[PDB]
């Protein structure tokens, strides 16, 4: 009995070459794609998407392999779960709806898809917002003792299969709830709608879904890092106007001052901290939504 | 169902103020303490201890909290599982045997005890051998993407309880075997005696033992690091003659070149690579034993 947290939003299964993308679709106006991250699904947007749907055609997609999206089989390079591939697949998905130029906001892994999309295919984006991330390269480049402890899961989940999978399998509920809780400002589940938590827990309960998340992290440790490294060492910058939002108690600001980092990656970036842990649209829905509305509706 | 892998060694429960240390004891001659690491017990020495026992009184001890040694209650700073506390406990154990001046070889966590012992209490040691480690400080200082992925368990096991404990409980047999196999040159369990693997497996099957191991890694992320840091910053060197052995395809090699690193930490160090993964005494027992004998006899 998973709750419908987007009342009045439609549901779309979008075929792509790499599998169907599930999305909730609501609103009208310029298209805005919202991408969640780990260990969540598209429902993390349920508190901000209605506000967004007042001004935008809001497409709230499950990432490839997450939620109700199909799970492409991975390979030794974790290709389908690299952000490059996810971006390409979501470009396909949006093209299926006739959106070849759209606004994009991503959180967490979804934000990594988003800035990778902006780097690979900037012509697809009108504007980009990334929530509580720095590029994957920067996390790895800032991987000292303190940060290795803080985001241990970057290296734990990237261990070769089936090591993370086997450990996660014993008590999946514990781990998904732990990560949800530990990255909030409060350190518990209070920020989350209980119905949303149930979506996250149910997705996490599927061993294939967990495997996909590890593949995501494996891509994050390897190919994603390599792709970022190429761009940063080539001085490739995102040319799409972008908003970097991060939680004052979130992960991004632990590594570095987020705006300074993003100004290295992006030629036109504005940013704002939000008093929030990592889960900006759930911990700080009003502030997050206002920031996104302000940013995306600015001409 | 545990094999005795040290025929002719005695079995000693050594009382200390923090709990008992289990030891197999064999041989005669100068005392030589052998300290295992993670995720093993003293039985990892089962192939090299007999050769050492030809010339030394070999004491093959389970680290505090590991194997059959008692598990002192930890605290919010993981104090009893800091290498400084383990070293103090092992020193007390050795004093119970009347050994106040002994040779010491450690592997993995046991080697971290050992060089910490050497820094804190160098008068206790005639000679030190460390097997396939760099100082804990060095691992954390060289922390980068490559190392974070390779020794992910340094940050994973150091997560606050009960996160690692809970995950480790998801498949402990898998986890201990995976650690054993993945750090060998072969990549599988073939370098190990199956009866030793069984010792490692049964110790790891105990949640309280696994908790101890997480306490050891939490110590290694916090106080052990801080203790090392003081020594580095003060330029404290190990004055004990020491041997650093490392596996050609081991942990210590990766991030740094082990002899050069240890030379920053010790005034009198020699070293040699052993054609081995991490588990030198089991993957390469003849070479390891030879090297130890030669160093400890000299």
Swiss-Prot record, chain B:
Changing residue 278 to N: Abolishes hydrolysis of covalent reaction intermediate. Disulfide bonds: none annotated. It holds the Pfam family Abhydrolase_1. Changing residue 38 to A: Reduced catalytic rate. Minor effect on substrate affinity. Residues 30-268 form the AB hydrolase-1 domain. Keywords: Hydrolase. Its EC number is 3.8.1.3. It is an enzyme of class 3 (hydrolase). The keyword ATP-binding does not apply. It catalyses: a haloacetate + H2O = a halide anion + glycolate + H(+); fluoroacetate + H2O = fluoride + glycolate + H(+); chloroacetate + H2O = glycolate + chloride + H(+). SUPFAM superfamilies: alpha/beta-Hydrolases (SSF53474). The record marks 132 as: Important for enzyme activity. Fluoroacetate binds at residues 109, 112, 153-154, 217. The active site is at residues 108, 278. One of its GO terms (molecular function) is haloacetate dehalogenase activity. InterPro entries: AB_hydrolase_1, AB_hydrolase_fold, Epox_hydrolase-like. Belongs to the AB hydrolase superfamily. Epoxide hydrolase family. Catalyzes the hydrolytic defluorination of fluoroacetate to produce glycolate. Has lower activity towards chloroacetate and bromoacetate. Homodimer. This is Fluoroacetate dehalogenase.
